[PDB]
Design a protein around this nucleic acid. Sequence first.
RNA 1: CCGGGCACUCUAACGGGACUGCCCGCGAAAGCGGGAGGAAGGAGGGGACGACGUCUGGUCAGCAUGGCCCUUACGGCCUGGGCGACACACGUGCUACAAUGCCCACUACAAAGCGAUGCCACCCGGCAACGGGGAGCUAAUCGCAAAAAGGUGGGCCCAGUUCGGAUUGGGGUCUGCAACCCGACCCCAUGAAGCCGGAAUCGCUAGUAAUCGCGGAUCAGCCAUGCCGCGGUGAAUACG
Lengths: 60, 116, 97, 97, 155, 83, 206, 23, 127
Amino acid sequence: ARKALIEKAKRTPKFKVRAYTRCVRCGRARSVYRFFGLCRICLRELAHKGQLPGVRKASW
Amino acid sequence: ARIAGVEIPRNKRVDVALTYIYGIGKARAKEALEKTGINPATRVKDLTEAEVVRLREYVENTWKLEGELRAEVAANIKRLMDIGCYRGLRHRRGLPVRGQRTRTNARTRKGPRKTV
Amino acid sequence: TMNITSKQMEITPAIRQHVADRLAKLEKWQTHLINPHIILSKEPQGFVADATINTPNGVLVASGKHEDMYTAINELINKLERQLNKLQHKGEARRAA
Amino acid sequence: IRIKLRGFDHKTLDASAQKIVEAARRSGAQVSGPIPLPTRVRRFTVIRGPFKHKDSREHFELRTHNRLVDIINPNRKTIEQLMTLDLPTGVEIEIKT
Amino acid sequence: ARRRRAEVRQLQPDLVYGDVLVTAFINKIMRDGKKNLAARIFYDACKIIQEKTGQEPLKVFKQAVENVKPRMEVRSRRVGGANYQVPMEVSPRRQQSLALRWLVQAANQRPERRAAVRIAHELMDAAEGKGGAVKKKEDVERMAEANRAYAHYRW
Amino acid sequence: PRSLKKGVFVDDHLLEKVLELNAKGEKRLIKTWSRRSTIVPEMVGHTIAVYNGKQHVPVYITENMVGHKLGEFAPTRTYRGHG
Amino acid sequence: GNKIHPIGFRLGITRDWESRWYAGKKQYRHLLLEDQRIRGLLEKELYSAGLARVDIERAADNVAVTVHVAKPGVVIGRGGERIRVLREELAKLTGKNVALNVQEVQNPNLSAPLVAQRVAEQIERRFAVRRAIKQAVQRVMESGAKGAKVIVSGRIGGAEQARTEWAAQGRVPLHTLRANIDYGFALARTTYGVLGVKAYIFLGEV
Amino acid sequence: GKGDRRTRRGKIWRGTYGKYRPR
Amino acid sequence: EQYYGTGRRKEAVARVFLRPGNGKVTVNGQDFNEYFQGLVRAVAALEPLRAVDALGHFDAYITVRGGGKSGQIDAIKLGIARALVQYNPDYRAKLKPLGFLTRDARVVERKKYGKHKARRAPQYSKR
RNA sequence: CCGGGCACUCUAACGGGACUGCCCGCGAAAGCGGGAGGAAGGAGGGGACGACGUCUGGUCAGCAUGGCCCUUACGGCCUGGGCGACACACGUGCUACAAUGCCCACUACAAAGCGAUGCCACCCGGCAACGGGGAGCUAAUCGCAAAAAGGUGGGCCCAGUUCGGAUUGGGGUCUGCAACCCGACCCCAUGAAGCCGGAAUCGCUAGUAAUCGCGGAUCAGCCAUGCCGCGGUGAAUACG
Ligand SMILES: [Mg+2]
Ligand SMILES: [Mg+2]
Ligand SMILES: [Mg+2]
Ligand SMILES: [Mg+2]
Ligand SMILES: [Mg+2]
Ligand SMILES: [Mg+2]
Ligand SMILES: [Mg+2]
Ligand SMILES: [Mg+2]
Ligand SMILES: [Mg+2]
Ligand SMILES: [Mg+2]
Ligand SMILES: [Mg+2]
Ligand SMILES: [Mg+2]
Ligand SMILES: [Mg+2]
Ligand SMILES: [Mg+2]
Ligand SMILES: [Mg+2]
Ligand SMILES: [Mg+2]
Ligand SMILES: [Mg+2]
Ligand SMILES: [Mg+2]
Ligand SMILES: [Mg+2]
Ligand SMILES: [Mg+2]
Ligand SMILES: [Mg+2]
Ligand SMILES: [Mg+2]
Ligand SMILES: [Mg+2]
Ligand SMILES: [Mg+2]
Ligand SMILES: [Mg+2]
Ligand SMILES: [Mg+2]
Ligand SMILES: [Mg+2]
Ligand SMILES: [Mg+2]
Ligand SMILES: [Mg+2]
Ligand SMILES: [Mg+2]
Ligand SMILES: [Mg+2]
Ligand SMILES: [Mg+2]
Ligand SMILES: [Mg+2]
Ligand SMILES: [Zn+2]
């Protein structure tokens, strides 16, 4: 159970509750940020690449 | 056997003392003392036999109590257990009723530890 | 008490109890074997019996490997024994001067 | 009379507010100098590795920086050439009345 | 620690007597960083030690501190196959602490109900050489005395 | 529990089967997958087969088991104790 | 495995994003989603060209995608031809005003992500990996770099025991923020698995 | 009392309001 | 007419306004002691002026924002000592050794990932 | 609040500044002990940052991937169930055992963040959860908002209690197609164990520990007492 799932998440559901976020990049269901469409992993990868506008490593 | 069936602690404030009746919390206590118009600050040992009978009369008639309350709670579980519903079943094993975890803990329902 | 973890394997209460029996060899030294942990696992080349045990004078941490699981469990116990015995007598080694 | 400046990059925010401050001040007349609004901050805290390892994280931040300018004595020699000023890519602008 | 000797924090003198010592003692009353409550209790105590024995809180407390300062104490040192309890002089810095610690501790062993009283009473008793904080002092000092035999084993 | 303002919830698709039985003159075993449905006063006397995830469990309904859900009487878990 | 990405580490100090544009929360995700789709078809078709960066700008339904490469030609096409054929394939996905430019790389042998792909290709073509690495470093140094370093990891030469090989010359101070260090990764498929090539070029300190 | 919902102290902790802690 | 110091401690900041008067003091739109009631930490806020026998020569109007009552107390202490130095620069000696001029940088240290607080590590049992 | 003004607080970009620079002493030197100046002194406090390598460490279940395996099924959809079981054992935590405390009332002082089927002032019903109204705000404006410990006043009077809040009965609210399994919240009633914890064992050297509350990610709701942050108050001790 993967592609059928990265798929069932794209489609509009028989009830509103069944709405769930997947990673727009890797398909990962858990730890998915609303703001990026990304999981915690992918978020890290692009950010390191610079493919995340304004997004930089924080140090305080 | 002061009120009602139980002898509420003298020495103490009547609002606290009334809590020592089964079926009477902080709340119902605050309520009887208004409805019978007496100072919650007065010690039970300081009550007019009048103020007392009032207190007694109101409370015994307002709320279901002591044995008669426990009987309903038993009757309540009695039936739940006999219709054979899930909440009933959990009683039927002495287990937890409110959807708690039982892999660990759950000791108050179970009793202290039962070695294998 | 006695805790065994069987990692990516199925083992019987029989086998479990056997581990308790072997580990008992450590009771010889008469010191508190506190919360001992036996872990059983199966590498490609053979089984592994890992164990971590705390006693009043320190920790026993050891590992056995062998084509045969039972033999691995024993080889573990040897190492556990040796260490336990080092704990129990190392303190004596310097009563003079 | 207001121009409101927001971007993910701060060095480009004073670029756009340097020029826009200058544009109205040239073509008459009064400009309420580029005011540094407080930054709204969005943190991203994430476990570094792909699997387990909870006690190691990497901290990520997103600064939506904030600026505001006022063109005080407005004077329509200004209101034209503004619709022809060179915006760097990383900032959006708000003008209302 | 391993590198150099650590350094004693200078305390900020207390606003009701300017005394570096009251501050220390206050702090040792302080649970959970609730220093306000700490000073209160203390000051309340002084109020009492004035009330009950008509003389200077400060003068009294300073005595009870002087009477709970252990001068010799034991410090353990395994030699060979026995852990010998060795007699050692206590450096004034430590004398202080122990004195304050014990003072509080005895005080909190008392049956009087409210914290503010107990501090008062223990302070009173210890100025007179009575009380637990003085008992702890002597228990310690008798202990060092018995073990006078092992004094040369000292560091 | 379910809010007093909103309904007393029953899956509509069981209520029909229930109603159809009243009129025609009851009664046959009613298979359902509706553990969530309230038992409702018109269900009394039926024997409804409730799915637990494995079996449709026969539950005769009584006047004392009325406000409860269906699944309360078809246990989901097999437990005979330990050791 | 321990080391941080030498790129994300220098953002706003020695290096600058491959995507500069503001957006608000309602939108950010959606813009970026396109950019993933964008770089997908672009890194797909332009690998042949020698793709080194996909710079991307935005204002409002109109975007400037600046491609960098050291073979500017294959992006052009037949006299202005291909560049457009993409803008059609492209702005069919974009649905919007896709200004698709082409920027020359003044020396692919001073651009990490390039150097990487080269070696990845050499080893996909069954070349002696230990050789390839020492060479790729040798060239980068000849092309004037203040230092170079390459890394290949995995079933090198077809070994069953994976292995890690690397070489370096001059300086590569990964700890220094003012050091200009271009990092490039290439992923080499083989019949027996995947190797990962990593490229390190030390251009200079600021 | 942080675990006694029926007091002020209880409701601050649970993050809620009620008879015993009003808004 | 008026003397000023900027007072800071932790997240607390204190705008201090010295004026001569009988010696009476105010904080944030109410009399000092009414704002700092029952908090024995107070009288050291006014402590720098005691160090130079300037107790009653001055009134004081003060607003105070940020932090808590005691940090704010500390803030004031700085500012009033600050303001005295423009009132009288020969006031360094007998305020500097008394450490009143200096601002202590001691700020709440940051909470770090993997710990429970800044430094409190989580408990762990080897075996 | 308005006129007015940016002084101040601040907000937030750009700089200054500390360099053992100077003084004395010991030193071949590097340095070390010390004084003044100075907000800061010998790395100012904290962060970001992790060498060749090691553990044939971790992850084929994020992803990528060689190879091996399945093909009316080892693929795919759905209803229900399960992941929440409970003789037991271990790890992490929460709340406590109380008077330096608990309750009620009145009254103060933060910071970082968040917010368009979103935060919701203010009015109304209801003990309350909440319901109905309904103003503002793309938010240094408007809202979440009350910070809590603290302060003043009043009760409790050492009692398994006005400690503690588990368990159970009953009555409700909300999200959601849906709260039997299996949500959170509110109110009446219930009012357990627990009187400071064996062997053993953890953290922390300063704005730290301890204690106190507030935000955020995820998220319809929520089992968060978890995690990542933020301030408030604020110690002890280091011979070695
Ligand atoms: Mg897949
Ligand atoms: Mg959902
Ligand atoms: Mg999700
Ligand atoms: Mg009662
Ligand atoms: Mg639960
Ligand atoms: Mg359960
Ligand atoms: Mg091992
Ligand atoms: Mg953790
Ligand atoms: Mg003692
Ligand atoms: Mg919270
Ligand atoms: Mg600041
Ligand atoms: Mg803190
Ligand atoms: Mg761990
Ligand atoms: Mg100015
Ligand atoms: Mg470094
Ligand atoms: Mg996979
Ligand atoms: Mg595979
Ligand atoms: Mg083949
Ligand atoms: Mg389920
Ligand atoms: Mg689970
Ligand atoms: Mg246990
Ligand atoms: Mg917990
Ligand atoms: Mg939220
Ligand atoms: Mg009891
Ligand atoms: Mg008991
Ligand atoms: Mg009680
Ligand atoms: Mg209670
Ligand atoms: Mg007691
Ligand atoms: Mg303890
Ligand atoms: Mg305690
Ligand atoms: Mg304990
Ligand atoms: Mg507490
Ligand atoms: Mg939530
Ligand atoms: Zn992902």
